[PDB]
Each structure stands twice: as structure tokens, then as C-alpha cells.
Design a protein around this ligand. Sequence first.
Ligand SMILES: *Cc1cc2c(cc1C)nc1c(=O)[nH]c(=O)nc-1n2C[C@H](O)[C@H](O)[C@H](O)COP(=O)(O)OP(=O)(O)OC[C@H]1O[C@@H](n2cnc3c(N)ncnc32)[C@H](O)[C@@H]1O
Ligand SMILES: O=C(O)c1ccccn1
Length: 394
Amino acid sequence: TESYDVVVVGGGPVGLATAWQVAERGHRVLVLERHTFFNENGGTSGAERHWRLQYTQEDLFRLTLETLPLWRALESRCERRLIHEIGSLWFGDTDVVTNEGQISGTAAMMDKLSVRYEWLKATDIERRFGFRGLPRDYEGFLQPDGGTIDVRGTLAALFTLAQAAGATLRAGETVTELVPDADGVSVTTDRGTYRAGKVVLACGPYTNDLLEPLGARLAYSVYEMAIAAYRQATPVTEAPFWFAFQQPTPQDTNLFFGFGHNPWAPGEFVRCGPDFEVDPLDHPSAATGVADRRQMDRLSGWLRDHLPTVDPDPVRTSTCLAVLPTDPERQFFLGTARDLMTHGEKLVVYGAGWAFKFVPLFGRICADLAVEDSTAYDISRLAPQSALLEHHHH
Ligand SMILES: *Cc1cc2c(cc1C)nc1c(=O)[nH]c(=O)nc-1n2C[C@H](O)[C@H](O)[C@H](O)COP(=O)(O)OP(=O)(O)OC[C@H]1O[C@@H](n2cnc3c(N)ncnc32)[C@H](O)[C@@H]1O
Ligand SMILES: O=C(O)c1ccccn1
């Protein structure tokens, strides 16, 4: 049984960022990853992730401002620009309400927070970005500060920095049991056992598998989402991230999005996807890894009709797992398990969120809680929510 100050369960971006921060602070940290580092079987896949500035949720705007300096520090340390301002384009029917929100409502929130944007008409959208055949009443905005994030560059940086700082990184090892006590946590994996001062759970959609035996269950839902990669057919002029807000059809939500071009890449491929209603998985093992045929056909057909800048026959289709609070009013689960079980403060939990954009911040917060039990950042609205009735003594 090896002993560490902190054991991180999960070697995705949040786990690696936490380990880098813990090790740089001079504590002994071990990261246990069930598959391989850089795997694309959890919530981290593809080459890119979006970082918009526009939100109707005040807390997301605040987190965005607090994370930016942390991205800059990371970029400096690894000698790589990781965030690229390519723009965030939201267009279509400006009043339809979707899981992404509503154009008009969001534009009012930008007006209020003093976030700049340009309002565009269908003809401007087709001219500037290459879309074709849009209904002439479609409108929307371009928030120029919207960015795209180099996912592979970020993972490489975090892995290398964590390793250089002394973190012990082990792959192909699955954590199967956690038992906190007053003096630390006992960790069992399919390869051995460990003793930790505290454990950070950054295991994507698997958090409940380790909390269940301890009498806790968090209120999050897991979704397998389809994504398709397409070859760029015509050279880009402006290729921002885009989301098409439309009225639903009787069979689907009729929503589609594209991540935009990847500046660090040769400009050969881009990725897009449908944003259709998807029922939650009962457990992550239910994921198949095969993108839903009908959704891929709908997306490819829409791109054939409306965005001829890309060859609409996908080069590759795949899936990614989203892990989100079941309550749409909540954005993230980041905190300890202090209110969920005895000695719960010894388990630091990153349990749900649409969060690649906050990876440097979340890693710092998890490191703070792992070695101090407190962070200077406000995480009051991110408290992990129990899926069970409260019957325990507090
Ligand atoms: C799927 C998805 C997510 C997404 C997105 C689009 C799609 C299709 N677009 C985003 C965007 O534009 N902007 C953004 O900020 N986020 C966006 N997301 C979400 C983002 O990708 C996720 O928030 C992020 O990937 C989460 O990272 P995290 O590090 O939390 O999790 P992970 O990569 O799933 O890694 C967890 C690791 O844990 C390992 N694991 C699991 N169980 C165990 C056990 N028992 N023992 C050891 N290791 C374990 C996994 O193997 C994994 O590597
Ligand atoms: O606004 C976002 O963050 C978003 C939406 C759909 C797909 C990817 N990113």
C-alpha cells in the first residue's frame, strides 16, 4: 500500500489539472486513470471546445472572467497559445427557447452586462460565413470574443506539467472502492491499494459508482452525444463557432451547431453536431460509441443544404459523454462530500458540468480543497447536489 497526500481518480483534463496544481504546491499526488491518458471515451474528445462569453447565468460570466488569467498562465508555462478567438455566432429564429437558451433573451443579457456583439441578418450570415438558403427572417448575433480551445494541446500541457512537477501518473488502473475515515482515505483499484490524505474524484460520469457504497448519489444525468467531422471544401473567410436556433419538427428539435475552424490545425477538418433531445443513460457503460444514424443523416443533410463550405459526407462520426446537473438551474457540481457522508470532506468532488472552458480554474479549486479544505473562489452555487432525501445529522 503506497501513501500519498492526494489521490486523483481520473486522468481527464480536470484530473490532470488538479494533479499539476497539487504537485506544484509541493504535495505527493497520484493520478489513477482506468484507460489511457488522452483517451476520447469520456467527456473529452475531438480537437476543440467552445468558450463563449455570452450567458444569461451571471455565475458563468463570473467564472469566465476568473478563468481567463489561469488560461494565460497555462499558455505561458507550456509555450502554446490554447485559446483562439474565432467568434460565437448564434442565429436562426431569435425567440425559440432551447436547451442552449434563446437568442433575444441572451442578447438582452449582453446588452445589460455590456458584452459587445454584432447583429446580423440572413443575407449577412450567408455572405460572411458561407451559409446558403437560410429563411430570410433568420437573424442572430456574432460575439467576436468567442473562443475555441485546443483540447489536445491542453491535455499535453497538463500531462507534461503534472509529470514535471512530480505527480505519479498511472494508466490502465480502475479505482473500484473509496473508504474515507478520520485520518484519510483507503483506495482500492483493480491493481492494488493506496492510502490518501484526501481523494479528488474527477472521473467524468462515474462519480456515483464510488459514492453509492458510501450512501451518497449525486443528482446528475449522463448523455451520449453524437459528433461528426467534415472536410472543409472551400477555404475559410470567417469560420466562427455557430449554433442554429430553429423551430422543432415533429421528429426532432431541428438544432445544429458547428465548433468552427481550428486555427492551430491545417484547416482540413471541422466538427459539427445535432443538439437533439437525448434520453439519459442509466449508467455510463450503456454508451455504445456509435453515433445515432438518423441524427447524423439529419446533420449531414442540413449541412448539404445550408453550409456548402464543407463536404457534407462525414469523414468520421463518433460520440462524447456529457455529464450535467439534472436540475437545469444548476451548472456544476464542484465541492467536497462533507454534507453527504461522514468524513465526506476527505472526498473532493468534481461531479458535473459543461466545463472544458473552466479546466484551469476547476483544477486549482480541486487542489485548494484537497490540501486546505477551502478555496478563495466562490463555489456556493456549485455545491454537489444529492439525489437523495436529507435524513442525516448536520
Ligand atoms: C461530450 C461533449 C462535451 C462538451 C462539448 C461537446 C461534447 C459533445 N462541448 C463543450 C464546449 O464547447 N465547451 C466546454 O467548456 N465544455 C464542453 N463539453 C464538456 C467538456 O468536454 C467536459 O466538461 C470535460 O471533458 C470534462 O472533463 P473531465 O476531466 O471532468 O472528464 P473526462 O474527460 O470524462 O475524464 C474523466 C476520466 O476518468 C476516468 N475514469 C472514470 N472512472 C474511473 C475510475 N473508476 N478509475 C480511474 N479512472 C476513471 C476516465 O477514463 C476519464 O479519462
Ligand atoms: O454553447 C456551447 O457551449 C455549446 C453548445 C453546443 C455544442 C458545443 N458548445
